[PDB]
Each structure stands twice: as C-alpha cells, then as structure tokens.
C-alpha cells in the first residue's frame, strides 16, 4: 500500500526514473491492477530499452492476464538482453510447466540454478517438476534439501502448501507453510481499510433457515463437481437456504447447469473480481456458514474468506490439508482421516462427519455400472457389458446363466462382439440394440464420455482393448504419477515378484514419466512385460475400465481421492496404507465407510501381504470383490442423500455452538 | 484405401493402425484417427512414428498440451527422430516462441539435411525475426528446393510466403496451383456431381445473389477493412449472404455484419465441406467471393466444389490462387496491370481506383480533425475528440491555422503535467481529457476500434520516446516485411538526414536486436532507430499522426497498415515491385492522388524520402495533401467503393449471362 504512495512521489520528484516505474508496476501487479501495471512497465522500457528486469516482470503480468504468447515474447527478450539472467530462465520454465512441456521446463530450471545457485523458488519448482515425471535422481538429497530451504525461510516459504504433503516435512512445518500463505491473503485485504462485518446472531431475517454459502472455482467440469453436484439440490429447503458462489465463468457443462438449476441462489463471483465488493455481496446475502472448497488450489480467492463476511467459516472436500489460517474456523473431516490425536496439524477445529467427509456422485453420474454381464471363453473382469437397457438385451438372448452376474456363452453373438473389438470398429447392432465399443464413447456421445449424460447404448469393455492379459492378475493404480515415489514403486515391485502371474496397470499421466517408472522398475529386477501403461481416458471410460482390474494398489504418499471413489465404484478392492498427512488417510476413510477393514494396512509388510494374498488366494478375491460390489450400494459411501442430511446435522451443531461460545471440535 | 481390409486379416498389426489413422486424418475424421493411433501404441508401446503423427492429429483438434506430450514422447523413444523434431518446433512457432522454433528446426536439419519442409519453415522463422545470416545462401537454396519439388509434383514454401523470397513469377503461380489442386483432391473423395447453376435473375426477384465467404468476420483486419460493405449494398439489385468460417467471437465486428447482411450464415457450425457447399448452392448464389485465399481459416474446399457460377478472389489474400475454380481476381489497374497478367491464373477484374478499401471513416472518425499545443509543429503534441470543437471553444485563446493551436498556459500545462506524470486522464472545463496510452483502462471497446471513443485523446512524441526537434520516419508493419535491401535503403536515407530517427515496432520483440545490429553494420548509434510496442488498434492508428513520413517496405507493403497510416495524414513513400503484395501501397496512393510519392527504383525512393525530411515546405504541402484528400478522394469512401463494386459484379454477371467463359474486365 505505502509502496504505491512512495513510488508515485519518486515519480513526482523525478519524472524519468525507469526503475521506479518498474517498481510501481510490480506492486500494482500485486493488488490486481494488471492494465495499469502493464502501462508503467512499458514506460520503464521506453526510458531504458535494455531493461531486462522490466521485460521479465512484464511477462509475469501478461501470464496473469492469460496472454501466454506475450509473456513468452517478454521472457525471451529478457534472456536475449541478458543471457545470464536467472529469473527470465526460472519464469520461462514456469510457462513451459503450465503448458506441460516439463522436459523443457526442467532444462530452464536447471539453467537458473547454474546461474544463481542459491535460488530457493526455482529449486522447489524443479523439484515438483521432477515429481511430475517420476525423476528420482539424488531423490534423498532433494528431500533433505527441501526440508532445509523451508527450515531457513520460516525465520514467504518457497514450497506450495498443496505440495508440502509430498515431502518429508514435519507437521509443524506443513502447518507453518499454510500459515504464511493465509497471512498473505490478509495483507492483500487490509489495503481495503474495511471495518469488521456485523454478523447475524439470529435466524430471524432468514425465516428460520440456516444460510449456507458454497464457494468453489470448480462448479463446472472439475473433480469438485464430479463428487458433490447433487449436494445443493438435496438440501432441506425448510431449514436451510443454499447460496452457490462460483469463482469461475460458466464452462458450458451439464455439471454447471445442475448446480445453477438446483441451488436456491447461484451467484457468479467471476464478474465481481474486486474482493471487497465480492465479500460485501456475501455479507449482504446474510450467510451464516460460508464453506471453502478450494483451499490452496487453482482458482482460489481466499481473500473473500480473509475479510470475514460470515460468523462461521469452514473448509470442505476440495482441499486435502490445513489452510493454516485463523480466518478458517473448522475443517469438515472424520476421525478416520483426521483422528483427534493429531488435531494440531490443523489450525482449524475439527468437524466430524459420521463416516467419511468424502462423497461421490457416481450413483447419479454412472448408473450404467450398477450392473454387469460377462462373455465366456468364468471371469468377472475379462470381457464386460454395461448398459441402461442391458437386462432387456440379456432377455433377448437364447441362453444366459445368472451366477447375481449374468453370463453370455460363446456364440455367434459373442463372436460379432469380440470381432468388433478386434477390428476396432465403433458399434454393431444385435437384436435391434446398440452394442458400442468402450474405446469409442466420444465418437458416439461426447457428453456421455465426460459424465455429463448417462450413456444410452450397451458398452463393451475388455482387457484386450488395453493389452491386459486374459490369464493373469491385474493390479492398477490410476492416479497421476506424481504421487508414486521410490518407496511405493519398491512395494509394488515386491508384490509383482511374489505374484509371477501379474501386471501392474498404470497410466501415462503424463506419458513423459513412463520411461522413468519403467527404468526404475527394471532396477529392482522386474522385466518390461510387467508394468502396463495406457493413456488417460475421458471420465466415463476411466470409471468403466476399473472393471478390468482385479485389485487396485493405492499410493501411500498421497492417496486416490476422486480416483479412490472411482475404483470403488467399478467394484474393485483397493489396498491402502494410511500415513500421517490427511492426503494419506483418505482411501482408508473411504474403506472404513465401505466396510473393508481387511484392506487397510498398518505398515509395508502388511500392505504387500494384503495384495499378494488378494492376487493368490483367488476365492478370497471373489469374496472381497463380492463384498465391495454390494457395499458401494448398501453402505453410506455413494449415498448423496444420507451424506447431505448428516452434513446438515453437523452444520446446525456448528450454529448452536456459535448461538450461545467460540469454535470448538465437533462430535 | 481400405486398410480396414488389411486389419481384418490381422487384428494386432500396429503399422496399418498407424496408417489408417493417417488416412482418416486426411478426410478430417480426427476422433476416429486418434482412436487408431492409441491402438497402434497399445500393440507397440515404443512406436515413435505413431506418437508423432498422433501429435499432428491432436494439434488439429486444438489440444496443444496433448500434442506436446506426443511430440516430446517421440523424442524420448528416439532422440534421433527428425520429423518429431520439426513438428515440436512448429508448435513453438505457433506459441510465438521463435527461438525454440529455430533451435528445434536445426536439430531436424542436423539429423536429416535433406529436409525441405523443415528448411522452408526455418527460413520463415528466420524471416520473422529478421535474422539474415547467410541470407543469399538461404534465398538461392529456397528456389532450388522449389525448382526440385515442382519438377516431382507439393512445395515446402507456402504460397503466402512466396512473395517474400526471390522466386520467379512462373514459380509463384505453380506453388499456388499445387495447394489449390490439393483442395480439389480432398474433395473428389466425396464424388459429388457438378452443381446446376442459375442462368437469369428470376428466382431471386431480379437481385444478384452475392456470398462473401470468410473466417475473418470478427476482431480481424478483414473486418477493419470491409465491415461496412454488406450494409451499403443496394437491396433492389443485390441480395447479400455472409458465410462465416469462424465461431462468433463476441466482437462488435461480428455483431455488425450479422445485423447488416441480408443473410448471415455461420458455416463454422457445418464442419463438413460437402454439406456446407450444398447449402451455399441452394441459397441460389450467383457470385461467391473468396476472402481468405491461403490464409488462416480458409476452407477452399468450399470453392473447389463449384457451388456458384462466378467465383472471385477479393481483398483478403494478396496473390493468385492458381486454382481453375477461381474465375476473377478483383484488383485494379495499378496493382495488377494487364501487361503483367501472366501471374494470375484468374482473369483480371478491375475496380476503377483501388481494389483496396478501409472502414476508417466509420471506425476512427475522432481523427478527421485535430488540435495541437505550442512551445508551430502539427505532430508533437496532438488532441483528438468527437467533442474537440466544443472543448476548444471553452478555451480563452485559440489560434486557427484548418488547424487549431492551443498556446502555452495553465490549460496547456495541465495536459503536459498528465503526460509527464503518466496519469490516466484529467478534466479541463468539464471536458474529458485522456492519455493516449491509457485507453484499455478507459474503454476496452474504444481501444480495439469496436466503439468510437467518447473522451478527448492527447497523443505526444514524448509518449513513444521520440525527439521534439527532429524528423520521424515510421514503418509500422510486422518485421518480417523488411529484407536486407530495404534496411540498407532506410539506412542510406537516415545518414543523409542528421536530424531524424526511424520509428519501428516490436513485432515481434525478439527481432529488435537483429535489426539494431544490421543497422549498425552500416548505420549510426542506438539512438537512430526507436522501437515502440505493438499497440491496441485505435492507439496504433491514432499515434501514426506523430510521424512525418512513412517508409513502406518494398518486399511486401502495408496493406491494412497502408490504410492505417494514410488515415492519420502521414504520407507514405513506396516503390511498387512485381508481385501484387508489393504493388498495393502504390495503388492506394494513386487513388489518394499522390503519384509524386511512388518511386521507380531504389534511388528515387531514397531521394523522395530525403526531400520529405529536408525540404520542410514541401513537407507541409504533401502532409496537407494527404490530411485533406483522405476525406475527399475515394480511398476511405465505403459507399462509393460499394457501388462500383456492385457495377463490376453486374458487368461480370452479364458476361456470363451471355453464355461466356470469364474474360478480362476493364
């Protein structure tokens, strides 16, 4: 704030001061004034045409305005002017990173570190890049060094809170990191001189209904909607009123459509870009509990929560960690992910949901996967059929043997099916029905593939489509590869050597980490026929293809979150080893809810034993599969209604307390 | 090809999967193609060629991050794979990262020195940043490449670049006939009959039915040129169909054309060329106009199927199409003299003055009139405003010259105080006074040209760092239009005129040190060439007024840029070449009535530009002549242009109505 005042006087004193133009421009760029910022930077450059530092900071602004090509020309021009300019290289690399050119990002990060060898920001950024591709050279050094960089800075931390969970920090360190990010949001809002807000201490203006405001930049196609899209419309209108605050433009999707149609009030904060004016509106709506569903994730506008427009402010489901900030009062969680014992990682108090804070709209979005049929030469997972009108088709058939899983005998029906898969042709007609190839969903109905529409054909899923073997156990992990580390790959390799008849199924997420994974795998005595890769698939293909797997091996470091509920939905047991950080206790929470305590491992030996057991004790696997396949329907896991209602109980609980006392832990 | 028979015999045949995919992609079946490329890789997981071809297919579907992963994967499987390198580079070029474009094209060359497509592309990238190392080598090599390729049936030189290199005129038409024939072949796939064409004007109620086909109905120089046109056509005699090949981008340009054409048809919604051409035919179109040629967004497959009896190249592509499906090129006596009609595969159809037109009067009327400030120069401190007259009239002393001059007082001081302090706007006598550099913060639609601005705009030399006391030569085009000859020419000019600077644009910024260096190689210190940033459309035209003379690039002139400069009242020196692209500035100037600004050779050009920088009453005269004749000649007169454009349409039709093949119209 006072920097601005200074600089304008510096420019009052002296009209022609290139550095102070550039300095003014950088602080206007902090407080969001991108156009004005950009103007002063060109003044600086007009004064001094070889001002590398302006060009580099101009590029940053252009990147923030989403002018990516202009930011490119700016960074390059600063590197031309001064080829040993460390920041131009760091910044350049960060564009390459956001475009998914990680090899070219890594190169430019290196070049920075060579030029200015103590440059903490660029080290941590490179370290995340290395994580993304599963490059683990000097891995132990790296980790030891990131703890170091952070140790130092604490006395702004160069490791992002959404990253801090992947590295061996202390929980004091992870909290501390989030604490200095939350603090930075306050320093942004205090510029606005805003008086404190006067909060309802009553429900009388609201007609006896609790006003709950849900803020998310992901009401649209993003994992957030894929999990909670039915929550607003399932709220009880008699006792609650729902306000949805989108932080992003309408992305066009049926996910966005649902939330706008179903909420009682939908407010687009993307056109109220000023945080003061936007937090004014939240207060004017009269919100009682305002829920944060971003934490430190792409889109967040935590400044809205930094100004305090609601008496109660809660974190929920979009952020797998602490915000570290005193403007957030609760975190909605459960005892199985955030045990009372470990409450002191979290700056916020702990609000317990009764089973798992995690939800999924799979019940609603993929209901063609509630029931299945298989084709013969019996295996539940080699050649699979799913359809809304599957039953009708089965009953159109001469012969079918229900074991309850219907089974199609190998006839001229099953020949035309498997030859479709064989040719890679899109679809066929049998008895007037659509029989469609699972590899071709986007061709047939795009919105079906994205999960915007339930599919309206019968879809065929086979291991042959993925190059999975028809006579061997399949392990999968379907996450982004960044969550695999050395230890984890070691565990999987162990399992793979005890179970000779097996393949571990991974994805090119990204494909540029595949050679690494396989290299490191082969250092552990594992041939290249053993780990299979296939590409990332459009949403519905993903969830469907989990049917081909036998068992899914969860990443202990950071669990499948969305990816977890995805695999459970296909009827595939997941083996997890819950760690310490909330991101490592999720798959375990989901399984406690689902009711498979048998799949939750206490340590590595336990983990590997569980999964080797599952891959050799075949009837134990038929037992466990059977148990998961029924319990996804019969347990609270996928039950958005039970979820919403119990969530409603927890909110009233939070109101009653504030109605009297200050925020305190919830059971 | 039924490779689908080949895969019938053998299911797990990776190569035919990759090949079917590459042929499905020919036809445009991208989702299907993409499907067979993942199959190819399911079978053979280190199949480089499929990963790289995959990339092409996802780059088409505009998944750029997807393409990158496919390219860089082809390079990790095989660091010696050149094709993958050339492709990787090509995406860098499209991201505007020209250095990486270059570093990557050379790797493709080092790996594979017989690589025509990657040499020619590298030459373009080099052209873009004005890197002229081994220029003559490069130039002679580019001909040899095409001589060789033309002799064995598809040039590695894009027809749109052909104007930029020393190719022959026979060679130009041939590169154009190739990309044209390629539109014909991609269409014969569909086996469609010839269409049955109208023969009189009877279905249409006596109206000629014109269809203007473009991808540039939006924030684009095409629309900055011809947006008024459809609305000025005579409903009694003409029925106007505008065929977009771009989704609606939300701009006013699109709104305007949508409101004023009689029929606006959004062909971006109909991706099939068969289905799209059938539509054009049933609208009963008599003349279908090609506004793209070989430019970004072309869908010339549309013109390849002949849905209309007369088909004319108009305004957007400054070259011949080489295509026998294009009947006339609308141009003029000065741009394409009949003497030199051999380049043109099309017959010549003449406009009376220029084929060139410009919507500047409608777009930028706040520049018809101007005020200056004192201590008399017309271009040191300038004011422009719809309400200038009233603003002036609110002032105590104003001296008229017709050019108002504000003397030096508290009023004149407060303006200068704003420019010095870089602040956004002020108020004098209640009138709104703005900084030329602050326009996107005042009104973003006024900045693009979508709206006439509503406050008064002050524009200065100090804003762009120009001398208050020296002559200013400008050129405002993208840097790729300059060549050695040209930069030599201007340097000559600049040494003859000690009080002068050449004012240049960062277009792209990374080209500035090249130009700076080659200049020094003959010229003077880094104070002779001033670089300014690329500007918002409006600031861009507006600030042109600060200059004394514009020096036009002979290799390819300002087209839109030519118009842009003249609209500010800045004279333009030009030397017409032999390609249409190098003649345009001279034709515009002929219409304006300034033939004394057209050079016959390099020497004349230097003499013209020197006289304008040293003779300062002759300067006042030609600046006067321009400032006036841009209103009174037919150059920026859209209504007159429209009418004679209508006259040439009828003249074109009546020839065909007599049962004739296309012939020259004069």
């Amino acid at each position: 704030e006072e920097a601005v005042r200074l600089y304008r006087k510096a420019l009052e004193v002296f009209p022609e001061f290139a550095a102070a133009h550039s300095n003014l421009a950088s602080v206007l760029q902090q407080q969001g004034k991108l156009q004005e910022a950009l103007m002063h930077y060109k003044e600086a450059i007009r004064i001094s045409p070889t001002f590398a530092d302006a060009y580099s900071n101009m590029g940053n602004t252009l990147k923030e305005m989403q002018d990516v090509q202009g930011a490119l020309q700016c960074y390059t021009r600063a590197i031309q002017i001064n080829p040993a300019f460390a920041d131009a290289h760091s910044n350049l690399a960060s564009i390459h990173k956001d475009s998914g050119n990680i090899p070219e990002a890594i190169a430019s990060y290196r070049t920075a570190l060579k030029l200015k060898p103590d440059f903490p920001d660029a080290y941590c950024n490179l370290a995340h890049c290395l994580q993304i591709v599963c490059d683990w050279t000097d891995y132990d050094e790296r980790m030891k060094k990131l703890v170091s960089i952070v140790a130092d800075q604490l006395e702004l931390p160069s490791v992002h809170p959404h990253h801090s969970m992947l590295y061996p920090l202390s929980h004091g360190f992870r909290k501390a990191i989030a604490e200095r990010h939350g603090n930075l949001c306050l320093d942004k809002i205090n510029v606005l001189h805003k008086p404190p807000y006067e909060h309802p201490k009553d429900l009388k203006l609201s007609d006896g209904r609790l006003r709950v405001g849900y803020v998310s930049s992901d009401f649209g196609n993003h994992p957030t909607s894929h999990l909670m899209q039915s929550i607003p419309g399932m709220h009880n209108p008699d006792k609650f009123e729902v306000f949805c605050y989108a932080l992003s433009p309408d992305d066009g999707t049926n996910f966005r459509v649902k939330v706008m149609a179903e909420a009682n009030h939908f407010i687009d904060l993307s056109q109220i870009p000023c945080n003061g004016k936007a937090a004014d509106r939240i207060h004017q709506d009269g919100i009682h509990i305002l829920v944060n569903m971003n934490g430190y994730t792409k889109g967040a506008r935590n400044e809205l929560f930094a100004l305090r427009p609601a008496p109660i402010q809660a974190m929920w489901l979009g952020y797998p960690g602490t915000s570290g900030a005193l403007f957030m009062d609760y975190i909605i969680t459960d005892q199985e992910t955030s045990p009372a014992e470990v409450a002191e990682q979290y700056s916020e108090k702990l609000a317990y949901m009764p089973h798992t804070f995690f939800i999924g709209d799979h019940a609603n979005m993929f209901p063609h996967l509630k029931k299945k049929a298989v084709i013969d030469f019996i295996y539940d997972n080699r050649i699979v059929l799913n359809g809304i009108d599957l039953k009708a088709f089965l009953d159109s058939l001469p012969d079918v043997k229900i074991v309850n899983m219907p089974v199609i005998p190998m006839n001229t029906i099953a020949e035309a099916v498997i030859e479709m898969i064989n040719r890679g042709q899109i679809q066929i007609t049998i008895n007037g029905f659509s029989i469609s190839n699972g590899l071709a969903t986007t061709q047939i109905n795009n919105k079906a593939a994205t999960g915007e529409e339930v599919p309206r054909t019968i879809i065929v899923t086979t291991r042959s489509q993925y190059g999975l073997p028809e006579d061997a156990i399949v392990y999968c992990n379907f996450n982004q590869l960044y969550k695999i580390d050395p230890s984890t790959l070691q565990m999987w390799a162990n399992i793979l050597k005890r179970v000779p008849n097996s393949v571990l199924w991974l994805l090119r997420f990204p494909a540029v980490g595949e050679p690494n994974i396989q290299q490191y795998a082969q250092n552990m005595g594992l041939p290249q026929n053993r780990i299979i890769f296939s590409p990332v698939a459009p949403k519905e293909e993903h969830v469907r293809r989990g049917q081909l797997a036998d068992v899914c091996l969860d990443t202990p470091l950071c669990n499948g979150h969305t990816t977890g509920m995805d695999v459970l939905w296909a009827g595939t047991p997941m083996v997890t080893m819950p760690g310490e950080t909330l991101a490592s206790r999720v798959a375990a929470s989901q399984l406690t809810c689902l009711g498979c305590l048998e799949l939750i491992a206490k340590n590595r030996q336990e983990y590997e034993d569980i999964a080797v057991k599952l891959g050799t004790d075949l009837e134990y696997l038929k037992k466990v599969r059977g148990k998961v396949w029924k319990q996804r329907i019969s347990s609270p896991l996928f039950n958005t209604k039970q979820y919403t209602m119990e969530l409603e109980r927890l909110y009233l609980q939070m109101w009653e307390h504030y109605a009297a006392n200050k925020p305190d832990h919830m059971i | 090809r039924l490779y689908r028979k080949a895969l019938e015999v053998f299911p797990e045949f990776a190569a035919a999967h990759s090949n079917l995919a590459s042929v499905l992609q020919q036809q445009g079946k991208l989702q299907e193609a993409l499907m067979h490329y993942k199959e190819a890789i399911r079978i053979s997981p280190t199949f480089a060629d499929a990963y790289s071809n995959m990339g092409n297919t996802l780059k088409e579907m505009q998944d750029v991050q997807g393409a990158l992963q496919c390219y860089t994967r082809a390079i990790q499987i095989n660091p010696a794979f050149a094709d993958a390198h050339s492709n990787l580079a090509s995406i860098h070029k499209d991201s505007g990262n020209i250095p990486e474009a270059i570093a990557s094209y050379r790797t493709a060359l080092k790996l594979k020195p017989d690589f025509p497509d990657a040499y020619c592309n590298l030459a373009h990238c080099l052209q873009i940043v004005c890197d002229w190392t081994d220029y003559d080598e490069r130039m002679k090599k580019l001909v040899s490449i095409v001589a060789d390729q033309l002799e064995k049936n598809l040039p590695s030189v894009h027809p749109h670049h052909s104007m930029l290199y020393p190719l022959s005129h026979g060679f130009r038409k041939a590169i154009a006939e190739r990309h044209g024939n390629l539109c014909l072949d991609k269409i014969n796939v569909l086996h469609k009959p010839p269409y049955e064409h109208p023969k009189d004007l009877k279905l249409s109620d006596g109206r000629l039915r014109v269809g203007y086909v473009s991808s540039d109905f939006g924030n684009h120089p095409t629309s900055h040129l011809m947006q008024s046109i459809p609305g000025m056509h005579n409903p009694d005699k003409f029925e106007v169909f505008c065929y977009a090949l771009s989704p609606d981008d939300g701009t006013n340009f699109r709104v305007k054309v949508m409101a004023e054409a009689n029929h606006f048809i959004d062909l971006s919604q109909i991706p099939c060329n068969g289905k799209a051409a059938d539509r054009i035919h049933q609208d009963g179109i008599h003349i279908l106009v090609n506004m793209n040629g070989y430019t970004k967004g072309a869908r010339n497959e549309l013109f390849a199927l002949r849905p209309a009896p007369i088909q004319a190249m108009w305004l957007g592509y400054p070259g011949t199409s080489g295509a026998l499906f294009m009947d006339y090129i609308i141009t003029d006596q000065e741009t394409s003299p009949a003497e030199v009609a051999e380049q043109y595969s099309e017959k010549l159809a003449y406009m009376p003055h220029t084929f060139f037109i410009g919507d500047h009067a409608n777009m930028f009327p706040h520049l018809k009139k101007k005020a200056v400030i004192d201590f008399i120069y017309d271009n040191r401190i300038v004011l422009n405003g719809i309400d200038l007259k009233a603003f002036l009239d609110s002032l105590p002393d104003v001296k008229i010259v017709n050019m108002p001059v504000i003397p030096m007082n508290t009023i004149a001081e407060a303006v200068i105080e704003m420019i010095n302090r870089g602040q956004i706007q002020i108020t004098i006598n209640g009138f709104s006074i703005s900084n030329g550099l602050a326009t996107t913060q005042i009104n973003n639609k006024a900045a693009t040209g979508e709206e006439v601005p509503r406050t008064i705009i002050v524009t200065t030399r100090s804003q762009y760092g120009l001398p208050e006391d020296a002559i200013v030569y400008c050129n405002f085009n993208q840097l790729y239009k300059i060549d050695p000859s040209t930069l030599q020419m201007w340097a000559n000019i600049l040494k003859r005129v000690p009080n002068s600077v050449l004012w240049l644009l960062r277009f792209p910024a990374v080209g500035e040190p090249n130009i700076q260096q080659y200049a020094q190689n003959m010229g003077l210190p880094q104070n002779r060439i001033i670089f300014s940033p690329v500007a918002p459309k409006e600031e861009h035209v507006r600030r042109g007024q600060l200059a004394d003379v514009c020096l036009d690039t002979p290799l390819c002139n300002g087209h839109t840029t030519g118009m842009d400069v003249l609209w500010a009242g800045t004279p333009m020196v030009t030397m017409p070449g032999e390609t249409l692209a190098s003649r345009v500035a001279a034709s515009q100037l002929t219409c304006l009535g300034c033939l004394e600004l057209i050079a016959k050779n390099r020497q004349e050009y230097e003499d013209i530009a020197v006289k304008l920088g040293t003779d300062l009453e002759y300067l006042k005269k030609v600046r006067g002549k321009v400032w006036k004749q841009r209103i009174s000649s037919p150059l920026f007169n859209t209504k007159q242009y429209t009418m004679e454009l209508e006259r040439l349409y009828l003249q074109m039709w009546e020839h065909y109505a007599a049962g004739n093949k296309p012939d020259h119209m004069i």
Binding site: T297, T442, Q480, V536, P538, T562 | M54, M61
Partner: peptide
C-alpha cells in the same frame, strides 16, 4: 486426456 481435457486438483 489425449483429445479432450482431464481436469485435476492442482496448486494456485
């Protein structure tokens, strides 16, 4: 994913 986009949770 290759052809479409696969949205994910990522840092700001």
């Amino acid at each position: 994913y290759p052809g479409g986009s696969t949205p994910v949770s990522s840092a700001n």
